[PDB]
Amino acid sequence: TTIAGVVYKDGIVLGADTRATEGMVVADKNCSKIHFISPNIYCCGAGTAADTDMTTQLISSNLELHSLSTGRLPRVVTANRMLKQMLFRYQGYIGAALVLGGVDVTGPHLYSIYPHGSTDKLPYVTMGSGSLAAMAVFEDKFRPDMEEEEAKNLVSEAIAAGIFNDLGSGSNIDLCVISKNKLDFLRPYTVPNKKGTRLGRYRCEKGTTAVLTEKITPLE
Amino acid sequence: GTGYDLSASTFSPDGRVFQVEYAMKAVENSSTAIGIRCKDGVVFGVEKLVLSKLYEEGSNKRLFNVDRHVGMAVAGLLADARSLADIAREEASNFRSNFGYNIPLKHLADRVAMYVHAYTLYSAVRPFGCSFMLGSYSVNDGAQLYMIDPSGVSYGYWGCAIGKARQAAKTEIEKLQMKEMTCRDIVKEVAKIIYIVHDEVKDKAFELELSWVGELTNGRHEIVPKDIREEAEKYAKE
Amino acid sequence: FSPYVFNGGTILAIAGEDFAIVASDTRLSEGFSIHTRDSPKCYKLTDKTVIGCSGFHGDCLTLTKIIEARLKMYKHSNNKAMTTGAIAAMLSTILYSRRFFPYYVYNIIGGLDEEGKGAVYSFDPVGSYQRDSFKAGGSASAMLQPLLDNQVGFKNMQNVEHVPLSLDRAMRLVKDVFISAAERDVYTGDALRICIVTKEGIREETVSLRKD
Amino acid sequence: FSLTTFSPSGKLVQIEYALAAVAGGAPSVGIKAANGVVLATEKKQKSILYDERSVHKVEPITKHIGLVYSGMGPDYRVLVHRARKLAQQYYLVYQEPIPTAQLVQRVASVMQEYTQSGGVRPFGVSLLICGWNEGRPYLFQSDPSGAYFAWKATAMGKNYVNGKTFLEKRYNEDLELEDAIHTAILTLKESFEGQMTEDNIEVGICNEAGFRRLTPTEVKDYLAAI
Amino acid sequence: TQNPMVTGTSVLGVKFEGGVVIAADMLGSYGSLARFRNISRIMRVNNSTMLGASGDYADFQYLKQVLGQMVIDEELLGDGHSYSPRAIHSWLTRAMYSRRSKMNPLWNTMVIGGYADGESFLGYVDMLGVAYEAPSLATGYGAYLAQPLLREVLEKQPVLSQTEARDLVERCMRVLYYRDARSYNRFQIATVTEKGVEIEGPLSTETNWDIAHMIS
Amino acid sequence: DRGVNTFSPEGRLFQVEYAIEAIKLGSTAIGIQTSEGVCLAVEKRITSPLMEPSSIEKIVEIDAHIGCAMSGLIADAKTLIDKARVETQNHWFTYNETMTVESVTQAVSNLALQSRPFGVALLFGGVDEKGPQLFHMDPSGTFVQCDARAIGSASEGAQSSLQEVYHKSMTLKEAIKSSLIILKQVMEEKLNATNIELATVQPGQNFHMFTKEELEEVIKDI
Amino acid sequence: TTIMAVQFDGGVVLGADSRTTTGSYIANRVTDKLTPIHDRIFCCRSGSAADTQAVADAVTYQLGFHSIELNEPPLVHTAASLFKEMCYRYREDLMAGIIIAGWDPQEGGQVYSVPMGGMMVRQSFAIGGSGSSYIYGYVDATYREGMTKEECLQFTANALALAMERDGSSGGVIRLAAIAESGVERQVLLGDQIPKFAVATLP
Amino acid sequence: NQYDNDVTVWSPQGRIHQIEYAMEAVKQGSATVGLKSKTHAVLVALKRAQSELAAHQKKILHVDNHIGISIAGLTADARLLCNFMRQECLDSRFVFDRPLPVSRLVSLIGSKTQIPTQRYGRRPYGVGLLIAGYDDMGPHIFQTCPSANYFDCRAMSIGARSQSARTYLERHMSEFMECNLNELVKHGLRALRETLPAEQDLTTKNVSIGIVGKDLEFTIYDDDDVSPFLEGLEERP
Amino acid sequence: GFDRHITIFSPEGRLYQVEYAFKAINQGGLTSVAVRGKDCAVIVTQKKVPDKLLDSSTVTHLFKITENIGCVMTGMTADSRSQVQRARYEAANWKYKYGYEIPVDMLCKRIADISQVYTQNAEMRPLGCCMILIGIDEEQGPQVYKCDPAGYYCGFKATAAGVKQTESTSFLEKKVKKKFDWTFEQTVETAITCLSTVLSIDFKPSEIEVGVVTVENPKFRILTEAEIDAHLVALAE
């Protein structure tokens, strides 16, 4: 799992891989590790996938309720505070490492959330098992106040480095770009890994697979 | 009246809480009290009815020490007054344990007034039948004096009186010129005012419980030495 | 961290024809250092019952004060003192009431019953008790008990008359066994407090022992 | 005692007084059209000191559930907050169904904490619910004591009787397009005393695309040519 | 509570004719670290009772706060009575025992000195709830080093005079500073008597190193 | 007034002055405490012959050295007697000795008013170190030591007769006959063995039923 | 990381490093460890970052509420009491070293230390963190009495710089906070501006 | 009268009526006197008897070696107060091994009894307490009324017709500090004897004495123990 | 019956208890005026001080709930202080749970929800105090709201509460109908002249206490004697 985010000139760009593995075997090749919170803020997940999903869904629901009650747009700082309180209440039992990014009325914000409840505001954030490669790519090729296309390219390069240099991450690149007026999900943005075609018709026709008994129950 | 002055939770047709309007009557009926903020401190004073000579030296005293630098002079129903004094002591102890140092008088008065308002808000519990002055002094904040009605809220008082004869005491209190008089002459004058208030005209002989707080006592609210303030009582008699 | 530490001390009680002797050392120590030379393990509870507490000193103190409180409560609730058997049973109930985190103490109750006969009730740290003519509790239990039962009980001795013990003879044997145990067991010594329980009351004697 | 109570022989006297209270004076008409549902109400603020963009009568409970109400607005605030919490809890339990119209019946059913646990004093507000995430629209009414009624066109104001009569005479009908909001405004006009304007009238619409509280611009546009 | 971080080193005290003297150095040992060199481990319980502790200084501060609050509450009633040092020692004993029973021990070994009713009292309580009173007391390594001198002095002199008692305490502090890693050359000496409690302050002991030339 | 807790305007709260007058509806019971022991005599007052006399019991042994006689609502007396048994057994288990009848009565009085107050009066009788003793406990959580007590519908007349027929140095043999003649005077029918229950208290005996229809040797003399 | 406070006449100066370490990887090289508890009160955090942040936020809650209910700026001693209570009641669960300083009109510049355990002490200067244990001799030897604002600022900057260059868990930039009656001024020393004592060991 | 129905409700004229009715509970009770001295505190209680066959009931309850109380009034919620005071005193013994001072115990009783005077559904403890104790400041006598407003007193009496005893104590209270133990006990006996009508007279069976002193722990004297004090009665019924 | 005694719906279909509480706000003898302007919002209420033995320093009815929101209270002072404490607690709790400061409208909504809970149920009673709270809000300009004992939170531009609130509201309606925006001189003068026309005493600059929140300068300024005197001099010119 490798997730990353950057603060560009007009907002936040979030990137993530789509390799959810059970131990050392790939289970999901298109696991959405970028989760919607509010139409202005997203958040990338890492660690225990189920805990991350439950926590991010709870935060999204609570913040949607809060925005409906207030009638205004929500704020990244509020989501950070909710996440920090929830995680620190359990003292790290929620093995969920999160990358929160969003656009508020006070400007775009990007935060890192750790399972024990630690948070900080950073121009660029990386998390996950392959976080080190993406962090190195940022440190090498980060420029403050960098435009939309260049920021997307930088995030794509960091995600690709994490994919090709960490075996437990990859198979797709998921991107999201957000600003004061734009929310654009990209899903698979670049597929640098394609399955080779199967040489020959490695298929089994009918007649094989002898059956002891068969039951047919037709419906309406 | 009738069905509206039965529980504090029942509002009057005009928008009043008659339970507290009757609880104030107990304070109005009980013995009076006086507290004056001297130039560098606050001086208390309460007359207490010796209902029978069978009692020992002054007991169930209307003066109480709620904290190291804070004292409470109460009038009204004395049992609930003592319970509220215990509540104030607990509040001061809790504040000292949590935030350290000494509880500011304004905050202590606000908290105890909020507690009293909580007791008068509901229906199962009844409003407290007592009114008291909280007096304290510190070098940083000078001398403060807050008075709490059985249902009202704390108010800053240069000099206040409560009990049987509030107006009669307050007239001479306003006659007295505070804010420039030292706490010694203020002790003498509070004794004088209390004896000006009627003591044996229609009641028994009264005892003079007077309290002290100020830089002359470096805070540390304590009862004035009665042996050396008997002469202040004598001056009040004259 | 552990909530228990062995503080030494040696207690001993003997049930006579009409007297109850409860003797104990007063040396409080743990590990290799001695806190004090005066820390009695005997505690008088009524005019006719004295207990001995040895082992963890804090638990000894707590148990003694709980016993005092329970005796006072029972006296108020029944308008009478508590019999030696009754306080023995109450102590047994208290000890097992905290079975899963027991008082690391050994209790021996010496006193006079309703009949006016010497009664000694030894106790286990977790509550077991039995009436005995004599028992020793503490670190020096292993080195003190054999002397007192082979003398008082005349065990392994033939052609000897089982004469009932006089008060003076019992006191002499108590002093002998304690002075013998003080030198072998380092926890024992520096003093000895002996409580004599009879109809006339409780008489205490403090004798000096090996100061090392 | 501490629940919905005061039911004598054959009667629900306390509930009947609550229903007399919810008679109110805010019509808050609702129309279930083929394309969607329109909930229109009247915001007749006392004097011009009050504001119309500050407080709202129509509240979006969730993505495509909108809510309009009747007398006892302070009770309605707590009720709509509870409804939002309940819908959010349902969406969290059954994650990602986009639950609006398969939830509109469910959220109306879970409006049992609304009255079946009255809270000593029953709620004094009747609320109309709209949802359209099923390929079909839904209009439901929950009253201070009952449950879902599944209305097609109704009013809950001071002149709710004549408002409903106007709705049926004007043939709320079934082929009516989404722009039955004109008929809803006309029904309000019958129970309105004044020259209704964009801030005086608040209306929310719930179609298959979702729910949206119409801004004063569109409200004035519809009110034009009436 | 469970594992102290900043620990206060040894404290000792002896009673004499008409009063008691205790002494504690002003070092807060963060393990092997002399992190805090200007902290007071001696508290004035009331006008006629003093208290010192050895161990976790945070626990000592908590006990100081609680005990001062309860003394203030006791003196607020103005009943004329007071918490006698015997009563104070018993209360601390019960508190330590209760904390041990709850398996949240207070990492402090406390020495309580007082002089009430014309008779000196000098109590002692530790983490495990073991309590007693002795004419001379010491904690930690002080009970190993300073205590033997006190015992040998008291064996020949059951009663003591104030000047020689405080001189003996100063010599014991010198010995402790000589042969204790956690010790420091800055100790407070507090004396309780009929006049009240008086604390000298940051007293220091003179070091002797003539034996340093005996290495060769 | 009507509130179980509100005090009366004059001197003493009501709804307990109502609970105490529940022995009036209850049946008569008399106990005598002598130096020989304690004699507890009650009437069963069987309404129909079909009901088994053994079923109707007003005297129940709390323990081997304590006997109790009820007068009032048998339902509430069952709970009070059960609590008395539990307290006695708990005390014996804790202290390995026989709980004093005074202590048992004190505990039952403590449990009497702590729920609408119990409306039964108990006549505890048993042996202790302070000789045989008898205690009269009343519905208003109050117990009093007594030597010869009467309770029930006609407690006034029975107590008045007992006041002059009792003397301080009597034995069991005279006490039983005095109680039986008084009972026969109070009741409506005769003192048949199937209608009268008797309980004896002895220093060296447990408290058993009075001879179980062979007690006619005491009623024939009557 | 390293955190340090000094008290001068009429104010205090705080110096903290920007590194927060996780194992041997630099989690955040620009960490802002000078959390403003109130307008004139600041917090220096060391240890478990999550625990420090949670404690600081809770104390900021309580202190702001208390100041609002008094209509008076809170005392630095009051804030230190809040921190000591919070750390002491949960010491077995919360492991954090906190340095507290600020200015109030009641006393002026004050400095308090509440390390792991929950003890409070008032000091002329406070030092804490993983990298603090390497500059004890320097901070004790090179500290004078009555130092002015600039002297304390430079001395704290030097101490933090050496703690950074020596300790492996400390690095990045230095954050300074000068608290006084006029207000608080926060500055960042980065790159060449870092006071460096170069060690040119001869070949 | 509506306003007299419940304790919580407040009368328009001032003080509430239920507590005023509560003070009638102690008024409707057997008389009991209690007086201080220089070194001793003595309680003389009238053991009211139901009938000649039954005992004279129990008064002057026992609390601790240095504290003893005398009840007057509603006996139901009086053993409860006795248990509370016993528990508090034993708690004091258990925590700091010292006899709980009488003033602090009385303050605790007042605080405990104040809450029922304000909580709905809770009747006030309509019991009059004459607490005799010996703290470090000599003997102390305290009177606790159901209004939870305690009083300290040189010599106070409560019960039926206790006003005559109050007057006698007041007239003779000057010569109370300098009196022997027997002299003070005889003063109390004369005070109590003046309460009952002339037909009644002091007997060994209908009186109880509670004495606490500096060297004398609290002891409850009755008939055989009272007889030495009852001698020299100077009987003027 | 008890329809008008407890918080239950009347047979006619009304709620009389809150209707009485609203008049309870009128009880107490005080008035307040809130005026929102082009860029600022000012609130002024009279300071009825009987006798000078009181401390005019603390007799105020306006407070700072947070760093940017200030309230003014009308009605019984005890309930007013309780609701002020509750509002301060809510603001602090919101700032703790959500990083950004609590919007004034949300704070009013929460206070009104608490009041609606109070008018619900029957154990408690509504608090007889009406709170008008103001504060600068980004993307919204100045904002003024009123929360009542019922739970209806609303009010804007010009809103008044107190005994003579109707006359003040009428005059402010006349002023706002006059289409001209008020700067940070005209808003204060409008509020002052409104309260002066309501109660014609010419308003010596000691009997009123005005709170101001502007946009360029945030925070709830409780303007001192000099500022109110200067504004009064400028107005009466």
Side-chain angles (χ1 to χ4, degrees), chain E residues 1-8 28-30 36 39-41 53-66 99 105-108 110, chain G residues 83-85 87-92 113-121:
Chain E
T1 51
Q2 293 288 345
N3 279 90
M5 292 311 299
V6 183
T7 43
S29 300
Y30 182 66
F36 310 100
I39 62 176
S40 304
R41 316 209 324 277
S54 65
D56 195 324
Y57 192 81
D59 271 354
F60 166 64
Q61 272 186 346
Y62 169 79
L63 277 296
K64 153 188 176 64
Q65 175 189 243
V66 169
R99 295 306 290 275
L106 295 176
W107 280 90
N108 285 152
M110 321 186 66
Chain G
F83 292 102
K84 67 182 290 294
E85 281 296 81
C87 296
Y88 180 81
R89 282 197 312 175
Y90 313 130
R91 52 185 298 184
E92 63 282 39
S113 298
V114 287
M116 301 65 68
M119 61 166 297
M120 183 185 57
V121 65

Side-chain angles (χ1 to χ4, degrees), chain E residues 134-215:
Chain E
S136 53
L137 294 165
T139 65
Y141 276 73
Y144 295 92
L145 276 59
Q147 183 62 255
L149 277 296
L150 314 173
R151 303 277 183 75
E152 183 178 2
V153 168
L154 288 177
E155 185 170 22
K156 293 179 179 179
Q157 300 184 43
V159 295
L160 289 188
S161 179
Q162 173 175 338
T163 63
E164 293 177 350
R166 59 166 292 99
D167 203 359
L168 162 61
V169 176
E170 200 278 343
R171 293 187 295 111
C172 295
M173 267 304 182
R174 168 177 281 100
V175 173
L176 275 182
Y177 171 76
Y178 281 0
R179 283 290 169 179
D180 178 80
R182 314 281 71 81
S183 181
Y184 184 54
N185 202 287
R186 172 194 296 267
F187 52 87
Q188 299 184 195
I189 290 179
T191 305
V192 64
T193 187
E194 188 191 51
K195 293 179 179 179
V197 289
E198 293 177 350
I199 303 179
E200 295 302 320
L203 205 63
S204 300
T205 187
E206 294 294 328
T207 187
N208 189 359
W209 296 106
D210 54 356
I211 69 181
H213 291 288
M214 301 265 158
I215 180 66

Side-chain angles (χ1 to χ4, degrees), chain A residues 16-20 28-35 49 53 171-172 174:
Chain A
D17 73 297
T18 77
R19 179 158 302 185
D28 191 334
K29 303 175 184 173
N30 279 254
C31 179
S32 178
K33 295 181 184 170
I34 298 179
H35 307 67
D53 291 331
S171 95
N172 289 318
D174 276 6

